[PDB]
Design a protein around this nucleic acid. Structure first.
Lengths: 206, 145, 56, 141, 63, 70, 63, 107, 143
RNA sequence: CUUAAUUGCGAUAACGAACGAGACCUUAACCUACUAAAUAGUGGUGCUAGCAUUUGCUGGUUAUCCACUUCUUAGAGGGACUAUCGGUUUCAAGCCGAUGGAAGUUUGAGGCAAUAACAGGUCUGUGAUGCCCUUAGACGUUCUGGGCCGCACGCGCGCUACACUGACGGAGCCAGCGAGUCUAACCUUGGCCGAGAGGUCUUGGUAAUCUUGUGAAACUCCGUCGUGCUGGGGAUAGAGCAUUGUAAUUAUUGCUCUUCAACGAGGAAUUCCUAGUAAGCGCAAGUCAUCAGCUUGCGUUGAUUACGUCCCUGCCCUUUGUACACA
């Protein structure tokens, strides 16, 4: 199919998955379907990213931080504490490097990567401190249209790095089994601990 | 980290001139432990000594360790161009000296007790004890002194 | 020619500074207000226009 | 020959001077093949405004730009403006508007900042501080 | 689950002696002709989900 | 070393049974797999490498995932 | 933070001084007004005069 | 000898934006009324002349910072300066600051 | 299809071209081989006992088809990492001065050396007499 | 009642006004448009060298011809004014929810910023300012240099780590701000010498040419290790080498080798900060003969938690109380 005459020739196996429809190049990020529970309308796939370097302002108008792409949010959310401040172009290989370990373990291409994480391992809620006085019993103030994504993604990628330092385990290779353990997991990672200490306030005290 | 069949012929923990040897670490850290032995000639204990380098430190055997005694005692018989040396043209005869493990402070205080008695400015800051090589010592004196 | 362009086109500005005291530092009673700014090559045309164009 | 074409792109340090000559499909920055884009990750942000009207659109034209400057990505999505302005620069004029509304509707629903001349700039740093909004230490004593 | 889906049709603002907690309404998705005054976190836009956790209770004063 | 980093020399058959139905393993895993560690973490991919059970599915510097090939 | 100015007093006295039956939603005469009636001291004076005289002339088609 | 022209780079040092254009156009009209072929006026780009200083005369108080700038505008022309432009400077169209130097480059 | 060396890799190229010719035979180890720290502040020399001669000399040969000219004052100002610089923040200061000038005695045998007027380097087509002729067989080996 | 605003709607013994705020001006916010670029360079260029045999790549012929701006450009103008529709609101000021976007914080940050003052502080920017010892003992100049660094022991601004994103070497060599030589001298590429610092032969540019794409880190790609005051740390101390200056002693420094201090995320307290931003890194200019761990200006990846409250400090505006007015 349609090569071209030039002095820099072109391979074969890839861009026929691109010239036909506006989707991914080699991997089948294709026609697989979503498991959409509550948090309705939080899929930026169709039309997605491929890696997370999409140009566009996203953060000062807080009503459009939800149109920051939902696949980019887990990439947005890793690197702190005097070691990797800047060097956020380490987070662009992590994408295919956690679309590396996900290939051996439950591919579920990105109509299924992020929509499965917040359901049974993260919040459907928040518990913020406006707590009256003396000893702040926090109001268990539940889900907003922006409280399903921000701390549900950008702190569970942080508390699950606490074994990625002082010994062998790499930040790019800690992510082997935390997304799946955010998809379906019994806390071999940081799944329960943002619904353990904040939910003892949140169950029957309100 | 090469193809290895490490039996008991490999050297275990033994004193080799005041250091119980870490044999299991690499051959660059086979000896580089003693005062007088910095980490800088971890290359130039075994640079062109015809001993293999990608092996760990079970090599440089019991009498290939004899060269280690005289390669660092005599710095010139193996043709380093003498820029890799700690004390030359000292007080007496004006030639080279590689100050070994006993000879670390054996000779530097001879250059200090050279000078406790010859009145100089860096004399009265060592036996008193004072920061002689360029530090303001007002604000030095708070947590370090 | 031994005097650069960028760093010494401001060098003419001393002849707005050395000059606009030189007219009126002994002569602070003169009445200067800014002459018609003018130049020719090799020589500078001089006109006086002030309170005291008569006594000095 | 033909005078150079003032379709044209800008960015931080990578001026995407969208030249177009009579070409045959060279995907370069005037010097590098299609397998040698290759940071293994940033491969496609150069391309994908290319692969939108078809595979080639290379019958008469190539992509002829050269760029000095740059950061690490700041050329990769700079000349993708020039790779989008290096195609449609003559299809406005020579072929017609119904070849733009019923055939360059490819060039409508995948504008991820293509013809946008940029509007996001880091601000100059202040005075009286290291950072752009950060300040020094007070220590009221 | 004792939770119920709820459109927050009309927005108020938010309250508190610190700034966080919020006055909102709910208009449910199931069992209409029934409404209870509840709360929500924060940056809420119009007519979107409030999954609860309580069944039927109340929390009003926001200091 | 002290606890399963360098060789564990008596146990040379364990490298020859390297995937005990145990899919996820890398350089980043083998240190506390009671086998070779990040010092000599590659000698299971030195020993059984070219044609056999192990085939390369990863790339990155110093750290390489491997897998019993289907 | 989007409110009037101190040259909105005269952006409504010379606006209707002789010039009501023009200036619809059409933006062309919403500058070709202000090069003749006003001698332009800033290109922003189109932005400070005619930036409101269509919404204010939405108020005339109401009542 | 006479009116074979010797390809002199017409140029004019100033600082302003249209005051040089008051004086540079005394050549721009005067080179094209008798209609030479022209590939001409090159805007010498704007140069800033930053100086930093503390605003205060004594180093007490809040050490606030005041900054400094200029814009060096200049034009140089890639043409033949005719004989009726080269010594026209020496008794007309010269102004303090407008020191019309005329550099030479032909081949 | 018509080949340029600008249509050829330069990352694993030296891994497959200049290290394919690793044992051409003429060693050129002029006494300052592997005794010097090879960068003026970098505390360590190469400790592999293999290479870093074609990595410094033969890096230039296809580097110089990508440009006009270089010299050793752009070789020392090319490769300096973090400097062993006190209790103070680090920099990039230059690499070694006389050591990487060994290519101005090593390249002299090849013919990729041409010395130009107007200073600097000239590259003749002798690089095309060992790289454009290997553009017929080792470019089709990296599918 | 809104607003960043005594800015504005309006109610009115107030009417008209005038500052301050906004306007005002830079700079990052663009132009299929031309009078213009050999103080940048593209298309064919007279073309050549290989390879591939398809005007396909490198180099120039300081004019081979040019079309000459589309990168710095302004000669000026334009385009985004919450715009536009639903929800609000007295139907007005207003304010939200989606859309289109070069262009929806007040276009982002700055540019002098009012009334009134403050025993704020500079006679240390002046041989401005009444006041002395003034001068020939002088509480000052010429000059050898001390001393401004002196240390018992306190307090701030900053730098480096407190320990497996820890330490080490090589393939791509990427920025941005600016700066730069005169009667001698800065920037200094290219080549020989030296392992470094540098020595020397040279070259270009009094300025978009040239040093420079400042060939920066951090990174892109790989090989090495093993958690111990490790090869974390480089304080301290010793001995050699080149430079700046007339001279480095109390080491101005940069380089080589040896020695390898404390500590293992800091108590009462306390500094800054709502998106290209914190927080890591690095580049040029200032003083510069020599010396940056500091400042002025600039790049490179781009998180957290909060887009709301008066709770602690503060701050304006009313009502109130006052024996207070140096408040």
């Amino acid at each position: 199919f349609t090569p071209v005459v030039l002095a820099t020739p072109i391979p074969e196996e890839v861009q026929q998955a691109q010239t036909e429809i506006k989707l991914f190049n080699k991997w089948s990020f294709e026609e697989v379907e979503v498991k959409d529970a509550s948090l309705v309308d939080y899929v930026q796939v169709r039309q997605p990213i491929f890696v997370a370097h999409t140009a566009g302002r996203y953060a000062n108008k807080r009503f459009r931080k939800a149109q920051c792409p939902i696949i980019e949010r887990l990439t947005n959310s890793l690197m702190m504490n005097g070691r990797n401040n800047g060097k956020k172009l380490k987070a662009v290989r992590i994408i295919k490097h956690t679309l590396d370990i996900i290939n051996v373990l439950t591919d579920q291409n990105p109509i299924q990567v992020v929509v499965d994480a917040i359901t049974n391992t993260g919040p459907r809620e928040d518990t913020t401190r406006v707590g009256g006085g003396g000893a702040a019993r926090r109001q268990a103030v539940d889900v907003s249209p922006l409280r399903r994504v921000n701390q549900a993604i950008a702190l569970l990628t942080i508390g699950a790095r606490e074994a990625a330092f002082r010994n062998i385990k790499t930040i790019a290779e800690t992510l082997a089994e935390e997304l799946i353990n955010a998809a379906k997991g019994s806390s071999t990672s940081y799944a329960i601990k943002k619904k353990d200490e904040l939910e003892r306030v949140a169950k029957s005290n309100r | 980290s090469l193809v290895v069949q490490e039996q008991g012929s490999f050297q275990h923990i033994l004193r080799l001139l005041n250091t119980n040897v870490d044999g299991n670490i690499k051959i660059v850290y086979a000896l580089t432990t003693i005062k007088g032995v910095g980490r800088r000639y971890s290359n130039l204990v075994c640079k062109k000594a015809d001993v293999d380098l990608h092996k760990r430190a079970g090599e440089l055997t019991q009498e290939e360790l004899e060269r280690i005694v005289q390669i660092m005692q005599n710095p010139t018989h193996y043709k380093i161009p003498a820029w890799f040396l700690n004390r030359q043209n000292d007080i007496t005869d004006g030639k080279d000296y590689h100050t070994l493990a006993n000879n670390v402070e054996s000779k530097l205080r001879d250059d200090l007790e050279r000078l406790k008695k010859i009145r100089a400015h860096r004399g009265i800051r060592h036996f008193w004890g004072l920061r002689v090589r360029g530090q303001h010592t007002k604000t030095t004196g708070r947590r370090r002194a | 020619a031994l005097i650069s362009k960028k760093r010494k086109l401001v060098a003419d500005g001393v002849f707005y500074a050395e000059l606009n005291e030189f007219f009126t530092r002994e002569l602070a009673e003169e009445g200067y207000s800014g002459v018609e700014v003018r130049v020719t090559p090799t020589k500078t045309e001089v006109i006086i226009r002030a309170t005291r164009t008569q006594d000095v | 020959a033909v005078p150079s074409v003032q379709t044209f792109g800008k960015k931080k340090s990578a001026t995407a001077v969208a030249h177009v000559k009579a070409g045959k499909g060279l995907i370069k920055v005037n010097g590098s093949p299609i397998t040698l884009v290759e940071p293994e990750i940033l491969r496609f942000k150069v391309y994908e405004p290319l692969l939108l009207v078809g595979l080639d659109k290379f019958s008469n034209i190539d992509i002829r730009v050269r760029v000095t400057g740059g950061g690490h990505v700041s050329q990769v999505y700079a000349i993708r403006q020039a790779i989008a302005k290096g195609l449609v620069a003559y299809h406005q004029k020579y072929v017609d508007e119904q070849s733009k509304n019923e055939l360059k509707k490819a060039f409508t629903s995948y504008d991820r900042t293509l013809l946008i001349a940029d509007s996001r700039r880091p601000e100059p740093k202040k005075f009286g501080g290291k950072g752009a909004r950060s300040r020094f230490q007070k220590s009221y004593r | 689950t004792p939770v119920t889906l709820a459109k927050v049709i009309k927005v108020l603002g938010r309250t508190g002696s610190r700034g966080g907690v919020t006055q909102v309404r709910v208009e449910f998705l199931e069992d209409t002709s029934r409404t209870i005054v509840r709360n929500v976190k924060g940056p809420v836009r119009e007519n979107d989900i409030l999954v609860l956790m309580e069944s039927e209770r109340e929390a009003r004063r926001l200091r | 070393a002290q606890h399963a980093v360098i060789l564990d020399q008596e146990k040379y058959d364990r490298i020859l049974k390297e995937v005990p139905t145990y899919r996820y393993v890398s350089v980043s895993v083998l240190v506390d797999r009671l086998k070779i560690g990040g010092s000599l973490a590659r000698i299971a991919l030195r020993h059984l490498e070219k044609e056999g059970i192990i085939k390369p599915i990863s790339k990155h510097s110093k750290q390489a995932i491997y897998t019993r090939a289907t | 933070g989007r409110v009037r100015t101190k040259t909105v007093k005269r952006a409504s006295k010379a606006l209707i001084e002789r010039y009501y039956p023009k200036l619809t939603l059409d933006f062309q005469t919403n500058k070709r007004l202000c090069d003749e009636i006003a001698t332009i001291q800033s290109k922003r004076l189109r932005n400070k005069i005619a930036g409101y005289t269509t919404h204010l002339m939405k108020r005339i088609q109401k009542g | 000898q006479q009116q074979q022209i010797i390809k002199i780079r017409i140029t004019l040092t100033s600082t302003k934006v249209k005051q040089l254009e008051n004086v540079s156009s005394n050549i721009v009209k005067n080179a094209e009324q008798h209609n030479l072929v022209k590939k001409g006026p090159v805007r010498l780009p704007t140069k800033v002349l930053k100086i930093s200083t503390r605003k205060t005369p004594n180093g007490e108080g809040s050490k606030t910072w005041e900054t400094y700038e200029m814009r060096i505008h200049k034009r140089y022309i890639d043409l033949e300066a005719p004989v009726q432009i080269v010594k026209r400077i020496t008794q007309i169209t010269i102004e303090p600051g407008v020191d019309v130097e005329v550099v030479v480059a032909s081949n | 299809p018509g080949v340029s060396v600008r249509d050829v890799a330069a990352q694993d190229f030296i891994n497959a071209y200049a290290s394919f010719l690793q044992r051409q035979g003429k060693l050129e180890v002029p006494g300052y081989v592997d005794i010097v720290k090879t960068s003026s502040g970098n505390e360590m020399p190469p400790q592999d006992a293999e290479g870093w001669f074609y990595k410094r000399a033969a890096s230039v040969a296809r580097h110089i088809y990508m440009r006009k000219q270089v010299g050793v004052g752009k070789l020392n100002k090319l490769y300096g990492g973090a400097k062993s610089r006190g209790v103070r923040p680090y920099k990039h200061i230059d690499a070694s001065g006389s050591i990487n000038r060994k290519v101005l005695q090593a390249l002299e045998k090849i013919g990729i050396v041409e010395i130009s007027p107007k200073g600097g380097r000239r590259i003749s087509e002798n690089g095309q007499r060992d790289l454009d002729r290997i553009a017929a067989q080792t470019l089709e080996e990296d599918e």
